[PDB]
Design a protein around this ligand. Structure first.
Ligand code: EQN
Lengths: 234, 10
């Protein structure tokens, strides 16, 4: 009922801000395709640009989540900054193709493991790919990926929140909504919901190493990080 | 957070 509506709003929010792999015209590039290097500049340029576009979509997504824009502006910002890498990493891993060991970005750009490494992932590469491989067999749909993204974002344990209890309260209906949706879709598998939740814990771990990678990449890249990336991650 | 503020309004 009221749970049904919350699910539908979150499904729509995600679907409308996230093109699926099947919808995209995959294309490749020859850029350092086979040799691991510390950084490929042309790949970094494409990757950072796509990242900027994805952050914009993530904000659009957040604004469609019930109650999000009712939080203080300071808390909306704090939540978005804290969840930024978690959501980006979830999104790119959602477009993993095992056969060629590739991930596909929102414009269709399809990079292999070596190119992902070369683009900026560096020491993060194998962990991110491990995550993608463990995500895939869960067979999540838009509602489930959308809900997990929302649960990751609307988290009351983030440092520097003005109203953490209020954030906790807003998260409660999302956890309930996912629990009831997952058991509807997969009645035979009651172990699915907690296995879904531990992806968040995995994501948190990866994004912590991600913040370390932001540091080391800044030393490697030619100029400065793009302004929006700076706002989110600095 | 100039850009983020702008995006949050729109
Ligand atoms: C931590 C590090 C390496 C340094 C700073 C940035 C560049 C923010 C970044 C970004 C991602 C990421 O996943 N970006 C995505 C870009 C585009 C899509 C899409 O098109 O769907 C999805 C994700 C991962 C790691 C890192």
């Amino acid at each position: 009922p009221e749970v049904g509506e919350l699910i539908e709003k979150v499904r729509k929010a995600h679907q409308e801000t996230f093109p699926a792999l099947c919808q995209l015209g995959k294309y490749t590039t020859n850029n350092s395709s086979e040799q691991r290097v510390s950084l490929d500049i042309d790949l970094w340029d494409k990757f950072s640009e796509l990242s900027t576009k994805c952050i914009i979509k993530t904000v659009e997504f957040a604004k469609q989540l019930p109650g999000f824009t009712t939080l203080t502006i300071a808390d909306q910002i704090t939540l978005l900054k804290a969840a930024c890498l978690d959501i980006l990493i979830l999104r790119i891993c959602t477009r993993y193709t095992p056969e060629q060991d590739t991930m596909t970005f929102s414009d269709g750009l399809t990079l292999n493991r070596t190119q992902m490494h070369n683009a900026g992932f560096g020491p993060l590469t194998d962990l991110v790919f491990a995550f993608a491989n463990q995500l895939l067999p869960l067979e999540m749909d838009d509602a489930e990926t959308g809900l997990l993204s929302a649960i990751c974002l609307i988290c009351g344990d983030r440092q520097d929140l003005e109203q953490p209890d209020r954030v906790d309260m807003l998260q409660e209906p999302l956890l309930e909504a996912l629990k009831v949706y997952v058991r509807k879709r997969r009645p035979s598998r009651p172990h699915m919901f907690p296995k879904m939740l531990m992806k968040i814990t995995d994501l948190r771990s990866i994004s912590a190493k991600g913040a370390e990678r932001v540091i080391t990449l800044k030393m490697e890249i030619p100029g400065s990080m793009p302004p929006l990336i700076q706002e989110m991650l600095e | 957070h100039k850009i983020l503020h702008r995006l949050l309004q729109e």
